Scaffold this active site. Structure first.
Site, short mmCIF file in Angstrom:
data_model
loop_
_atom_site.label_atom_id
_atom_site.label_comp_id
_atom_site.label_asym_id
_atom_site.label_seq_id
_atom_site.Cartn_x
_atom_site.Cartn_y
_atom_site.Cartn_z
N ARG A 12 5.07 -12.43 3.15
CA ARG A 12 4.93 -11.26 2.83
C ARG A 12 4.90 -10.87 1.63
O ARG A 12 5.77 -10.88 0.54
CB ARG A 12 6.24 -10.46 3.65
CG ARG A 12 5.29 -9.44 3.54
CD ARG A 12 6.54 -8.68 5.28
NE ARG A 12 6.13 -8.85 6.62
CZ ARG A 12 5.34 -8.70 7.23
NH1 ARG A 12 4.64 -7.89 7.31
NH2 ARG A 12 5.36 -9.40 8.13
N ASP A 19 8.92 -14.23 13.64
CA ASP A 19 7.18 -14.37 14.02
C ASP A 19 7.56 -16.13 13.60
O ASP A 19 6.24 -16.56 12.90
CB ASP A 19 6.76 -13.33 13.42
CG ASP A 19 6.24 -12.14 14.26
OD1 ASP A 19 6.82 -12.61 15.29
OD2 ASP A 19 5.73 -11.36 13.93
N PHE A 43 -5.02 0.21 14.00
CA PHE A 43 -4.46 -0.30 13.31
C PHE A 43 -3.61 -1.53 13.57
O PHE A 43 -3.84 -2.69 12.54
CB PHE A 43 -3.41 1.46 12.53
CG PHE A 43 -2.52 0.17 11.65
CD1 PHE A 43 -3.59 0.64 10.28
CD2 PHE A 43 -1.54 -0.39 11.09
CE1 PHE A 43 -2.39 0.44 9.00
CE2 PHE A 43 -1.25 -0.76 9.78
CZ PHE A 43 -1.68 -0.71 8.91
N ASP A 58 6.69 -8.39 23.05
CA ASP A 58 5.76 -9.08 21.89
C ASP A 58 6.06 -9.92 21.83
O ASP A 58 5.39 -11.47 21.88
CB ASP A 58 6.07 -8.28 20.35
CG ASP A 58 5.27 -9.46 19.54
OD1 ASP A 58 6.05 -10.27 18.70
OD2 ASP A 58 3.87 -8.97 19.20
N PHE A 79 12.73 -2.39 6.60
CA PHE A 79 13.69 -3.17 7.42
C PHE A 79 12.90 -4.18 8.72
O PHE A 79 13.06 -5.38 9.31
CB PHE A 79 14.42 -2.11 8.07
CG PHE A 79 15.52 -2.55 9.49
CD1 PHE A 79 16.36 -3.31 9.70
CD2 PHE A 79 14.82 -2.23 10.35
CE1 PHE A 79 16.73 -3.57 10.73
CE2 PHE A 79 15.18 -1.73 11.75
CZ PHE A 79 16.42 -3.09 12.00
N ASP A 115 -4.63 -5.24 12.40
CA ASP A 115 -3.77 -6.15 11.76
C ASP A 115 -3.68 -7.46 12.63
O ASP A 115 -3.56 -8.87 11.98
CB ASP A 115 -2.70 -5.73 12.18
CG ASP A 115 -1.11 -6.10 11.77
OD1 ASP A 115 -1.30 -6.03 10.35
OD2 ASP A 115 -0.59 -6.92 12.11
N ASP A 116 -3.44 -7.40 13.87
CA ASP A 116 -4.56 -8.99 14.56
C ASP A 116 -6.10 -9.06 14.16
O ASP A 116 -5.56 -10.80 13.67
CB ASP A 116 -5.11 -8.11 16.36
CG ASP A 116 -3.10 -7.68 16.81
OD1 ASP A 116 -2.05 -7.69 16.30
OD2 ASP A 116 -3.06 -7.78 17.85
N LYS A 129 5.41 -0.84 19.94
CA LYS A 129 5.53 -1.81 18.24
C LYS A 129 5.00 -1.39 16.61
O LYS A 129 5.29 -1.23 16.11
CB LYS A 129 5.81 -2.85 18.45
CG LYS A 129 4.41 -3.58 17.77
CD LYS A 129 3.89 -5.36 17.94
CE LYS A 129 3.00 -6.17 17.52
NZ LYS A 129 2.67 -7.05 17.04
N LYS A 151 0.63 -1.35 -0.09
CA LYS A 151 -0.17 0.31 0.20
C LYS A 151 0.94 1.33 0.48
O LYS A 151 0.84 1.93 -0.25
CB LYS A 151 -0.50 -0.23 1.17
CG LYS A 151 -2.49 -0.94 1.23
CD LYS A 151 -2.98 -0.75 2.60
CE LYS A 151 -4.10 -1.10 1.62
NZ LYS A 151 -5.27 -1.56 3.15
N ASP A 188 11.25 -9.00 11.81
CA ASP A 188 10.36 -9.05 12.11
C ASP A 188 9.27 -10.56 12.13
O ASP A 188 9.37 -11.60 12.85
CB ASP A 188 8.45 -8.11 11.94
CG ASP A 188 8.02 -8.88 12.57
OD1 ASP A 188 7.51 -9.11 13.86
OD2 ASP A 188 6.37 -9.26 11.77
C1 LIG Z 1 1.63 -2.69 11.22
C2 LIG Z 1 3.05 -2.80 12.39
C3 LIG Z 1 3.04 -3.83 12.44
N1 LIG Z 1 4.50 -4.48 13.23
C4 LIG Z 1 4.85 -3.64 14.32
C5 LIG Z 1 6.45 -3.80 14.35
C6 LIG Z 1 6.91 -4.89 13.71
C7 LIG Z 1 6.47 -5.91 13.14
C8 LIG Z 1 5.02 -5.39 12.45
C9 LIG Z 1 4.21 -6.88 11.55
C10 LIG Z 1 2.95 -7.59 12.21
P1 LIG Z 1 2.57 -8.64 10.89
O1 LIG Z 1 2.73 -8.12 9.50
O2 LIG Z 1 1.15 -9.06 10.57
O3 LIG Z 1 4.27 -9.64 10.55
P2 LIG Z 1 3.52 -8.11 13.63
O4 LIG Z 1 4.06 -9.03 13.92
O5 LIG Z 1 1.36 -9.05 14.27
O6 LIG Z 1 3.30 -7.25 14.52
MG LIG Z 2 5.06 -10.51 12.20
MG LIG Z 3 -0.13 -8.99 12.75
MG LIG Z 4 5.58 -9.55 14.81
#
Ligand SMILES: CCC[n+]1ccccc1CC(P(=O)(O)O)P(=O)(O)O
Ligand SMILES: [Mg+2]
Ligand SMILES: [Mg+2]
Ligand SMILES: [Mg+2]
Ligand SMILES: CCC[n+]1ccccc1CC(P(=O)(O)O)P(=O)(O)O
Ligand SMILES: [Mg+2]
Ligand SMILES: [Mg+2]
Ligand SMILES: [Mg+2]
Lengths: 341, 338
Positions: B99, B94, B224, B161, B85, B228-229, B185, B44, B90
C-alpha cells in the site's frame, strides 16, 4: 451471590448495543455481534466487572445507592468486561494461543480466522454506545469516555512492550529486567484490571478530588503488578482444567516474572541452557525450561514473594483515607491472594 | 491545499506524545512515531482535505480565522489517522502486500500480526488530539462521538465484506448486498465524517441539513467505492501504490456483481471455477471474462451516469449546504485512476 446478580443484566446490555446503533438496520451484523459477544464474554470470573460494582457499592454512601445506580454500576462493569474480551481476542492472536475459557480462541474458529480483527473493533465500539445511551446527559460522561480511551492507550503501550520483537535478539536477554517487567505489567494489566474499574466506581459515587484519584490509582497499580505476577506463575504451573488455557509464555519467549527470576539465579551454564531452550515450541526445550525453574526453586520464591507482596498491599490499603474504603481494597487483595486460576 | 495541510503534521505527532502516558515510555513514543509516519505518508490526504474544504466552504468567510483553519486541519488529520488505522487492519484481512508503494505495515518482518496492537495505538491517538484541541469546546462530545460512530459503521461494513460465498454459490452477490457493504464500509468515514466535522466546526446543527448532507455523502461514497473496485482490477500499481486482491479474495466487488449480471450459463461455471483462487491462470481467466463481458465499457458509462446524477443532486442542495462544495468534491474524483 454477586456474580449471578452481575450476570443477570447481560441480555439487557446486548439489546442496548443493537437498539442504540446502526445495528438496528443490518440484522446479519447485529446477530453476528451477539454471537461474538456471547462467546467472548462467556465463562470466567467476571472479576473486573465485579470489581467495578464492588467499588461503587463500597465507596458510595449506602443512602445514595438505588436500584438504578446498581444497574449503572453493573453496566460500567460490563463495559470493562467488553474491553477485556476485546483485549484478549487480539492478545490470543499475538500470543499464538489455542484455547481460552476452555474452548478454541475466537480467532482459531474456522468461520472466523483473521476476521477476528474486525470482530474486535465491533466489540470495542459497543462500549461507547453503552456509555452514550446511559450517560450522555450527565456531568461524568466525558470522564467516562476519556477513561475508556486512556485505558486502550495504556494497555496498548504495555502490549507493545510485551510483544515487541526488539525485547530480545537471539541469545540476548539483557532486556529481561525488573525495570522492563515493571513497565510492562503497569501498562498492559494494572491500569485496565484495577485502576479502570475502581476509578469507574469512584466517578459513579461522585468522587472527583484529584488527590483521592491519585491515591487510589497508586494503590491499584500495585495490586495489578501483583495480579500479573500471579498470571505469569499460573501460565507455567497452572492446571489447564482450572485456567481454561494452555500456557505459551515459554514458547513465545515472554519477559514473564519467572523468566526474569530465573535469570536472577542462573549459573553460567544454566544461562546457556536458558538461552538455548527458551522461546521454542519443541516440547523437549519447553520441558528443559520448566526443569530449570524447578532446580532454581522458583515455586518457593513465588509463594514467599506472593505473601510478602500480600502483606505489603494490605498495609498500604489500611493506610488509605477512609473516603477510599480501606475495606474495599483489603477485600480486593484478599479475593486474589493464593488464587490458582 | 495539500502541503499547507501536511505542514501541520509535526504538531499532531507532538501532541500525541505529550498529551498521554507516552511521555514516561520513550520506547513506545518512538515506536508510535514510526507507526504514524509510515502509515500516514504519501497518498492523496483526500479525507483530511475534504474536512478542511468542507469547513472553508460551509463557514461564512467573515468567521474564518487562522485559528479555526488550524482546527479544521487538525480534525482532517484525525480522519487521516482513522483511515490509517482502518486500512492497517483491512490489509491483514484482505491478504494485501503493498500500500502506498511500500509493504503494508503488517507485512513488515518486525511487525507481523502485532500490527493489531499498533492499530489500537493509532485509534487511541485520535482522542488525545481531540482532547488537546477541543476539550473545553461545546462541540467536544459531538467530535468524540462521531469518531466512535465511524468505527462502528466501518466495522459493520467490513463484516459484510469479509464474512465467509459458500463454494460455487454466489447467490448473495447482489446489488442489495453491495449497497449495504459500501454504505457502511466506505461512505460513512470517507464522506459523511469529514463533511459532518466541517459542519460542526461551522456551527451548523440543523438536523434537516445534517440529513440532506448525509444523503448526498452516502451517494458519493458508493460511487467512490465503485471506482475503488474498478481500480483493484484495472489500476496501474505504479500509480495506485497497491496490488489488487479482490478476485483472489473472492470479494463482492462491483465487477463481480456486474459479471454475474451478464454471464451466460457457461460463463457462470467459468466464474465459479476461477473466482476466489490465488492461481495466476484462474485470476487471468476472470480478467479475460471481464473483458469479454465488456465490463470496462460498462464502468466508463456507469461512472458517467452516476457522476451526472451526483451533480444533479448537489446542484439541488440547500444553499446553506454549499452545492459548490459537493460539485467540487465530485469533480476531484470523477475519472480518477488511483
Ligand atoms: C475507499 C475505502 C475502502 N475501504 C473501506 C473500509 C476499509 C478498507 C478500505 C480499503 C479498500 P483497499 O484500499 O482497496 O484495500 P477495500 O478493502 O477494497 O475496501
Ligand atoms: Mg482492502
Ligand atoms: Mg479496493
Ligand atoms: Mg477490504
Ligand atoms: C491479567 C491481564 C493480562 N493481560 C493483559 C493485557 C492483555 C492480555 C492479557 C492476558 C494474559 P493471558 O490471559 O495469560 O493470555 P497475557 O497474554 O499473559 O498478558
Ligand atoms: Mg496471552
Ligand atoms: Mg499477552
Ligand atoms: Mg498470561
Amino acid at each position: 451471590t454477586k456474580k449471578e446478580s452481575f450476570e443477570d443484566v447481560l441480555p439487557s446490555i446486548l439489546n442496548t448495543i443493537t437498539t442504540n446503533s446502526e445495528l438496528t438496520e443490518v440484522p446479519e451484523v447485529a446477530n453476528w455481534l451477539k454471537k461474538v459477544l456471547e462467546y467472548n464474554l462467556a465463562g470466567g470470573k467476571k472479576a473486573r466487572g465485579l470489581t467495578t460494582l464492588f467499588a461503587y457499592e463500597m465507596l458510595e454512601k449506602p443512602e445514595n445507592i438505588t436500584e438504578e445506580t446498581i444497574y449503572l454500576a453493573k453496566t460500567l462493569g460490563w463495559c470493562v468486561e467488553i474491553l477485556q474480551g476485546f483485549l484478549v481476542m487480539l492478545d490470543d492472536i499475538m500470543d499464538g494461543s489455542t484455547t481460552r475459557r476452555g474452548v478454541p480462541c475466537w480467532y482459531q474458529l474456522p468461520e472466523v480466522g483473521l476476521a477476528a480483527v474486525n470482530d474486535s473493533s465491533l466489540m470495542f465500539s459497543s462500549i461507547f454506545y453503552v456509555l452514550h445511551a446511559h450517560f450522555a446527559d450527565k456531568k461524568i460522561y466525558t470522564n467516562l469516555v476519556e477513561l475508556f480511551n486512556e485505558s486502550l492507550m495504556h494497555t496498548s503501550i504495555g502490549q507493545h512492550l510485551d510483544v515487541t520483537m526488539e525485547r530480545r535478539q537471539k541469545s540476548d536477554y539483557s532486556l529481561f529486567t525488573i525495570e522492563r517487567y515493571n513497565a510492562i505489567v503497569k501498562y498492559k494489566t494494572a491500569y485496565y484490571t484495577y485502576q479502570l474499574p475502581v476509578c469507574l466506581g469512584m466517578l459513579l459515587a461522585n468522587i472527583s478530588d484529584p488527590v483521592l484519584h491519585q491515591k487510589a490509582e497508586d494503590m491499584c497499580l500495585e495490586i495489578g503488578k501483583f495480579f500479573q505476577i500471579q498470571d505469569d506463575y499460573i501460565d507455567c504451573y497452572g492446571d489447564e482444567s482450572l485456567t481454561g488455557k494452555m500456557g505459551t509464555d515459554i514458547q513465545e519467549a515472554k519477559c514473564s516474572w519467572l523468566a526474569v527470576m530465573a535469570l536472577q539465579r542462573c549459573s553460567a551454564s544454566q544461562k546457556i541452557v536458558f538461552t538455548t531452550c527458551y522461546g521454542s515450541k519443541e516440547p523437549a526445550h519447553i520441558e528443559r525450561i520448566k526443569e530449570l525453574y524447578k532446580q532454581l526453586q522458583l515455586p518457593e520464591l513465588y509463594a514467599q514473594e506472593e505473601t510478602r507482596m500480600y502483606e505489603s498491599l494490605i498495609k498500604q490499603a489500611h493506610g488509605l483515607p477512609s473516603e477510599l474504603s480501606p475495606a474495599l481494597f483489603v477485600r480486593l487483595i484478599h479475593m486474589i491472594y493464593k488464587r490458582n486460576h
